[PDB]
Design a protein around this ligand. Structure first.
Ligand code: ATP
Ligand code: ATP
Ligand code: ATP
Lengths: 537, 107
C-alpha cells in the first residue's frame, strides 16, 4: 500500500481562511512534515509524530472554520465530532465508557494492521467544558475528575498509539489541566488574533468575489476604502456587514404593508451601491472590543479657528516636542505643562496637539469617568492606564484638569494626599528599556501647583493666552461670521475705544445668548454683555 | 445647537419663594423629561449614597433627547454649617464635575 496523506484535488485558495496564512504555514510545517516526506528517510531518522493541537482566541475568528477545513483537507476516515459536554451521563461509570468508545476503533486498527493504517480525526469542541482543573471543579461528584483521568490515561497511556490526531479549541486556555498541556499530548498551541488591514482586504475580496462574477456589484465600490474605515472588525462582523448591505439593497423591491408583493421586473435589475455600505456602517453594525474609538468629536466640538498669532506658536511648540521625543537616546521621558486663565481652550489645543502626533498609543485620562470614586479607586485607574502605556513602543498620555483630579477646594485647603504622591512618582519614573513616553498636563491654577512643589517635576511649561486686542475680536467674529457688515462697523465704532479681556469659551456663550433677542436689540444687548462681564485686566 | 448645556442659578433672601418659582418654570417648559432632585428624600444618607443617587438621575436624564432637572437647596445638599465651616467634599466635587459634562451627541 502507498496511501497518500493529502487530497490530490486541493488548493490553498479554496480554503478561504484569509489572514491566518502564516499561522497555517506554521501548523502545516509542524503537524505534517513527518508524514509528507517519503518513508525511507523518516524510517532512518525514526521521528515520532505530534498528536494534539490546541487552538485558542477571542470570539469570532477562524477557529471553527479552520478546524472544518483541516478535517476536509485530509483523505482518511471521516472525523468524529464531539459537540461540547454531551459525554456526561446519569449512571455511575457511564462517562468513561463513552470516552473510550471513541478511541476503541483506532486502537483496534493500529493493533491489526500495524504501522500501515490510515488516520483518524477526533475533534473536541469547547474543550473547557470537560478538562477543567481536577483541583478546582466542584466537590459534589467525582465524574469530572474520573473523566479527566480517563482522557489522560487513554490519549498517551502504557500502550503506544501514534496514528491519531486530536484537535481542540477553546476560549479560556489557562484553566485546562496542565498534565494535558505537555509534549506528546496537546502540545502546539496558537493564538488566532484580530485581522490586520491586509487580512481585512482578503476577507472582503473572498466574500465579494461571487457577487463580482455575475456583475451584481456596482463598479464604484472601493474595497480599500472600506478596509481603511473598518477598524477592529473581526471576520464575523466583516461578513455580517456585507450581508446587511445586500439586504438593504434587496429590500428595495418588496412591498409589505398590505399583502406582500415583489416586482418580477426589478428583481432582474438588482445591484448594490456604496451608499448602502455607508449606511450599514452606522445604523446596523457596530464593532465591539477594539482599541481607540475615541470620541474626539466630544473633546473638540468646534475644531479650531486661528484668531491670532498665539495659536500657531503653541501648535509649533507642541510639534517640536513631539519630534524631539521621537528620536532620542539620552532622555527617553519628556513632560510638558499647559496652563492659562480659565475658559481659554486649554483642553482643545492639548487634544489637537496629541491627535496631530501619530503615535500608536494615544490615551486621555480624565476625571469625568471618575464620579464618586474613593481615594483608592483613582490610584488603581491611573496605575492601570500607565501600565497599558508602558507596553507599546511609543506612547503619549494626556492628564487634564489636575485641580479637579485632586479634589482641591480653597476653604481648608483640602485635598487627597495619596493621589498627589502617586502622580509625583509616576511622573518621575522612566519607562521600560527602549520605550519612550510623553505626558501632557493641563491646569488652571499655576500658583497652587507651585505651592505643592510639583511644578519642578515637569520639564517645561507653555502659556495659552486669551483675546487681548479689539482687532482680534473683530477677526474672530468674521471667522464665525454671525453678524453683518453694518453691525460689524457699529460694534467697531465703540469697541475700538478700549482693549478687551475675554476668553473664547465665553465669547461663544455671549454670542448665542445675544442671538435670542429681536433684531433691533441684538447689537445693544451684545455690547451691554461685553461691558458688564469683561471687567478684568 | 452650539450650546447644548445651559445653567441658571435662582438666588435670593430666605423665606422668599425660590423653590416654587423654580418648579413653576419647569412645569411651563412642557419638556419630555422633567425631574426634581430634592434633599428631603434622602434623610440620613452618607456621602456615597448621595453621589450614587445624583449620578443615577443624570444618567437617566441623558436618555431623552431633551430634559430639565432641578437641584434645589444646594446649601442643604452639601452639609454646610457656619461653625468651622464643615461640609462634604465628595458631593461638591460631584456637582462641579457634573455641571461641566456635555451630554451625548445631539441632546
Ligand atoms: N479569518 C477569516 N477569514 C474569513 N472568514 C472568516 C474569518 N474569521 C471568521 N470568518 C467567518 O466568520 C465566521 C466565523 O465563525 P467561526 O465559528 O469560525 O468563529 P469562531 O470564533 O471560531 O467560533 P466561536 O464563537 O465558537 O469561537 C464564519 O462565517 C467564517 O467564515
Ligand atoms: N481656537 C480655539 N481653541 C480652542 N477651543 C476653541 C477654539 N475655537 C473654538 N473653540 C471651542 O471652544 C471650546 C472651549 O471649551 P474647552 O473646554 O475646550 O476649554 P478650556 O479652556 O479647556 O476649558 P476650562 O476653562 O473648562 O478648563 C473648545 O472645546 C472648542 O469647542
Ligand atoms: N407670588 C408668589 N411667589 C412665590 N410663592 C408664592 C407666591 N404666592 C404665594 N406663594 C406661596 O409661597 C410659598 C413659598 O414657599 P417656598 O418653600 O417656595 O419658600 P422658600 O423661600 O423657597 O423656602 P425656604 O425659605 O425654605 O428656602 C409657597 O407655598 C407658594 O405657593
Amino acid at each position: 500500500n502507498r496511501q497518500s496523506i493529502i487530497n490530490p484535488d486541493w488548493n490553498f485558495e479554496k480554503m478561504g481562511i484569509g489572514g491566518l496564512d502564516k499561522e497555517f504555514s506554521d501548523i502545516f510545517r509542524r503537524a505534517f512534515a513527518s508524514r509528507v516526506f517519503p518513508p525511507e528517510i523518516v524510517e532512518q531518522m525514526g521521528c515520532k509524530h505530534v498528536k494534539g493541537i490546541l487552538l485558542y482566541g477571542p470570539p469570532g475568528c477562524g477557529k471553527t472554520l479552520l478546524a472544518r477545513q483541516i478535517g476536509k483537507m485530509l483523505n482518511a476516515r471521516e472525523p468524529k465530532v464531539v459537540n461540547g459536554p454531551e459525554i456526561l451521563n446519569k449512571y455511575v461509570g457511564e462517562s468513561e465508557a463513552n470516552i473510550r468508545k471513541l478511541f476503541a476503533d483506532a486502537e483496534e486498527e493500529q493493533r491489526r494492521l500495524g504501522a500501515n493504517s490510515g488516520l483518524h480525526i477526533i475533534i473536541f469542541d469547547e474543550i473547557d467544558a470537560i478538562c477543567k482543573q481536577r483541583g478546582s471543579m466542584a466537590g459534589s461528584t467525582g465524574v469530572h475528575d474520573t473523566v479527566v483521568n480517563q482522557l489522560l490515561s487513554k490519549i498517551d497511556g502504557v500502550e503506544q498509539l501514534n496514528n491519531i490526531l486530536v484537535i481542540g479549541m477553546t476560549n479560556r486556555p489557562d484553566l485546562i489541566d496542565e498534565a494535558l498541556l505537555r509534549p506528546g499530548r496537546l502540545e502546539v498551541k496558537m493564538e488566532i488574533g484580530l485581522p490586520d488591514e491586509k487580512g481585512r482586504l482578503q476577507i472582503l475580496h473572498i466574500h465579494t468575489a461571487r457577487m463580482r462574477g455575475h456583475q451584481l456589484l456596482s463598479a464604484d465600490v472601493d474595497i480599500k476604502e472600506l478596509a481603511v474605515e473598518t477598524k477592529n472588525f473581526s471576520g464575523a462582523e466583516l461578513e455580517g456587514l456585507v450581508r446587511a448591505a445586500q439586504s438593504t439593497a434587496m429590500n428595495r423591491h418588496i412591498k409589505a404593508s398590505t399583502k406582500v408583493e415583489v416586482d418580477m421586473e426589478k428583481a432582474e435589475s438588482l445591484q448594490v451601491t456604496r451608499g448602502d455600505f455607508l449606511a450599514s456602517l452606522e445604523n446596523d453594525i457596530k464593532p465591539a472590543f477594539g482599541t481607540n474609538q475615541e470620541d474626539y468629536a466630544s473633546y473638540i466640538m468646534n475644531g479650531i479657528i486661528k484668531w491670532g498669532d498665539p495659536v500657531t506658536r503653541v501648535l509649533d511648540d507642541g510639534e517640536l516636542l513631539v519630534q524631539q521625543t521621537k528620536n532620542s537616546d539620552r532622555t527617553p521621558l519628556v513632560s510638558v505643562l499647559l496652563e492659562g486663565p480659565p475658559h481659554s481652550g486649554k483642553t482643545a489645543l492639548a487634544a489637537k496637539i496629541a491627535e496631530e502626533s501619530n503615535f500608536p498609543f494615544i490615551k486621555i485620562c480624565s476625571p469625568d469617568k471618575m464620579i464618586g470614586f474613593s481615594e483608592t479607586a483613582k490610584c488603581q485607574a491611573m496605575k492601570k492606564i500607565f501600565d497599558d502605556a508602558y507596553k507599546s513602543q511609543l506612547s503619549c498620555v494626556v492628564v487634564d484638569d489636575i485641580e479637579r483630579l485632586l479634589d482641591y477646594v480653597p476653604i481648608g485647603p483640602r485635598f487627597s494626599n495619596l493621589v498627589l504622591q502617586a502622580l509625583l512618582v509616576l511622573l518621575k519614573k522612566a519607562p521600560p528599556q527602549g520605550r519612550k513616553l510623553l505626558i501632557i498636563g493641563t491646569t488652571s491654577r499655576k500658583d497652587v501647583l507651585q505651592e505643592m512643589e510639583m511644578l519642578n517635576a515637569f520639564s517645561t511649561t507653555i502659556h495659552v493666552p486669551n483675546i487681548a486686542t479689539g482687532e482680534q475680536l473683530l477677526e474672530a467674529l468674521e471667522l464665525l461670521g454671525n453678524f453683518k457688515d453694518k453691525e460689524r462697523t457699529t460694534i467697531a465704532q465703540q469697541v475700538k475705544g478700549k482693549k478687551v479681556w475675554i476668553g473664547i469659551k465665553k465669547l461663544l456663550m455671549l454670542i448665542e445668548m445675544s442671538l435670542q433677542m429681536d433684531p433691533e436689540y441684538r447689537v445693544r444687548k451684545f455690547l451691554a454683555l461685553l461691558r458688564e462681564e469683561g471687567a478684568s485686566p
